[PDB]
Amino acid sequence: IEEGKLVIWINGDKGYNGLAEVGKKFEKDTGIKVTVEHPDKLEEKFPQVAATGDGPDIIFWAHDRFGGYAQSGLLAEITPAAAFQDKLYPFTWDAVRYNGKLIAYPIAVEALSLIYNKDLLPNPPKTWEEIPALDKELKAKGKSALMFNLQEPYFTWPLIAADGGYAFKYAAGKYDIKDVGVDNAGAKAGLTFLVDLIKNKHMNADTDYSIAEAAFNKGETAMTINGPWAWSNIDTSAVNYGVTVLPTFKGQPSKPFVGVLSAGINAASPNKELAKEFLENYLLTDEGLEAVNKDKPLGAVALKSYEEELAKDPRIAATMENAQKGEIMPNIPQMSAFWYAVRTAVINAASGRQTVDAALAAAQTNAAAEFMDPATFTYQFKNVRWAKGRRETYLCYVVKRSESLDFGYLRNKNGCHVALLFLRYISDWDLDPGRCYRVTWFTSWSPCYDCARHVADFLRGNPNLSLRIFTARLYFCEDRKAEPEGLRRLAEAGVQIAIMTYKDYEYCWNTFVENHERTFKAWEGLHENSVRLSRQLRRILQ
Ligand SMILES: C[As](C)(=O)[O-]
Ligand SMILES: [Ca+2]
Numbered sequence: 178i179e180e181g182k183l184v185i186w187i188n189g190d191k192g193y194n195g196l197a198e199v200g201k202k203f204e205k206d207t208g209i210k211v212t213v214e215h216p217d218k219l220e221e222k223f224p225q226v227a228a229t230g231d232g233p234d235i236i237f238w239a240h241d242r243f244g245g246y247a248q249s250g251l252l253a254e255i256t257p258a259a260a261f262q263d264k265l266y267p268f269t270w271d272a273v274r275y276n277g278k279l280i281a282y283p284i285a286v287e288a289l290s291l292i293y294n295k296d297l298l299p300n301p302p303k304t305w306e307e308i309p310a311l312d313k314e315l316k317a318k319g320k321s322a323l324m325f326n327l328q329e330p331y332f333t334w335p336l337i338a339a340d341g342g343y344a345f346k347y348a349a350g351k352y353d354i355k356d357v358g359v360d361n362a363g364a365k366a367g368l369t370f371l372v373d374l375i376k377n378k379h380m381n382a383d384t385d386y387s388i389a390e391a392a393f394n395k396g397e398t399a400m401t402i403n404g405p406w407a408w409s410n411i412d413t414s415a416v417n418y419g420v421t422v423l424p425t426f427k428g429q430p431s432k433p434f435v436g437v438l439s440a441g442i443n444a445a446s447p448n449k450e451l452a453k454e455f456l457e458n459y460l461l462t463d464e465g466l467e468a469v470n471k472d473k474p475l476g477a478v479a480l481k482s483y484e485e486e487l488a489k490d491p492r493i494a495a496t497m498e499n500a501q502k503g504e505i506m507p508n509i510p511q512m513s514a515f516w517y518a519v520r521t522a523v524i525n526a527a528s529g530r531q532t533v534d535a536a537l538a539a540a541q542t543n544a545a546a547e548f549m550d551p552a553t554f555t556y557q558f559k560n561v562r563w564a565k566g567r568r569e570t571y572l573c574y575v576v577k578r579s580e581s582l583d584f585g586y587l588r589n590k591n592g593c594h595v596a597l598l599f600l601r602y603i604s605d606w607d608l609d610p611g612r613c614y615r616v617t618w619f620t621s622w623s624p625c626y627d628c629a630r631h632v633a634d635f636l637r638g639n640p641n642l643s644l645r646i647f648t649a650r651l652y653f654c655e656d657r658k659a660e661p662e663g664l665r666r667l668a669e670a671g672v673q674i675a676i677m678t679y680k681d682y683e684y685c686w687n688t689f690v691e692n693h694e695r696t697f698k699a700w701e702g703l704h705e706n707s708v709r710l711s712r713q714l715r716r717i718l719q
């Protein structure tokens with residue numbers, strides 16, 4: 178990693194030649210060389226390539242990706258002056274805030290808007306409630322009122338959240354992953370309205386992005402819901418199209434997720450002051466943003482002065498308005514479980530498989546985290562030999578795609594063993610045979626014979642699923658030594674079985690436990706018992 182020199186990473190779909198122009202001016206004035214790279218898949222790169230040797234000095238990406246970096250400690254904390262912060266819209270600073278600290282500079286703002294055909298619909302509706310009648314009217318004329326992608330919750334959330342639904346509760350640059358607004362009354366209302374639009378044949382349950390885009394671009398529908406990225410395509414077609422504020426629901430604005438293009442600084446960068454000088458005095462300026470805007474449109478921008486210039490284009494003003502009425506995309510990783518849950522819900526409610534209430538309840542439980550009591554964990558997962566009296570069995574689990582679809586813990590309930598309860602849970606999911614899933618268990622007890630058997634058969638029935646089991650203790654029922662054959666059966670089915678080591682207890686302590694910010698405290702003989710049990714399991718597995 179060079180010193181006295183700036184290396185900038187930004188995606189290829191951005192304005193990087195304009196950015197290179199900016200860096201050229203910076204190099205001209207300060208004699209400090211600046212090179213813009215736009216490598217393919219840089220956002221996947223950075224969390225690793227930068228975590229060790231070097232990376233870029235500055236990285237441009239949507240803010241939600243930075244949170245994951247920030248907790249890894251890969252992003253330098255910034256403290257720009259109030260005088261500089263006032264140059265940007267205050268809500269954009271909230272997007273670059275992680276755990277109370279500012280981890281990046283806001284650049285651009287994007288959100289969904291209501292795109293309408295001006296020839297079909299010169300006066301687009303202000304409310305969602307208007308849309309059924311309007312559709313009934315347009316369907317007599319061979320058109321439809323509205324088509325947008327219903328398959329992805331990103332597009333359907335603005336309506337669902339309007340009456341008070343939300344992802345995670347946000348305070349002072351911090352998100353509560355235990356607080357989730359998915360099954361609350363507002364979300365119920367919004368999703369009920371959507372499903373009612375489908376039941377009444379105003380919209381179609383199978384409509385997706387390309388279908389909606391094709392429909393609107395060909396003039397087959399009066400409205401669609403979409404972002405700036407779609408605009409040029411509509412430019413190619415012949416459609417007279419406006420872009421305006423999303424319709425209200427029950428008097429309240431639709432609330433789309435707001436992406437914020439942001440510039441983070443490498444925590445491993447020697448050049449941090451150079452980066453701040455560049456970003457503050459060169460990039461974020463009317464001229465600096467103008468430069469990259471010439472190359473490719475940023476959409477709406479975080480800088481007030483230039484946004485006032487860009488907003489003379491009413492579609493950008495619409496983008497900004499919808500953004501200011503929407504909610505900031507949470508930058509926490511648990512968001513991935515949100516996406517999967519809500520999507521599922523919205524599908525199951527749209528096809529009539531589930532009621533709105535049931536779907537949103539399941540989605541709520543999936544998205545919201547439930548943490549174990551610390552004393553409970555310490556007692557139940559102790560790997561020592563006084564292994565009797567732990568009469569229950571606790572199972573911590575993570576379900577992935579690498580995307581973390583679910584995580585949490587179970588315990589034996591009403592006589593039913595915990596492994597079977599998990600099978601019961603995961604069975605209910607509709608898993609795509611096409612896709613592959615990775616499930617990880619941390620169990621206080623190793624499964625008994627019957628549990629191990631049912632798990633083995635389940636995994637035989639689902640080859641797209643793979644399972645790792647990290648166990649604290651090895652369970653045996655008296656007078657059999659049936660259990661070793663069960664474990665052996667699991668290994669035969671392709672289960673990876675291992676005894677929990679210190680690092681596993683660390684992970685569980687900082688993942689599944691409510692620890693009140695206390696470090697994991699090992700007991701005496703943890704490693705000893707772990708090795709002993711490891712040996713023993715090694716004997717059993719042959
Ligand atoms: C060790 As058991 C009772 O969870 O199969
Ligand atoms: Ca949960």
Ligand SMILES: [Zn+2]
Nearest residue numbers: 594624625628
């Ligand atoms: Zn069992």
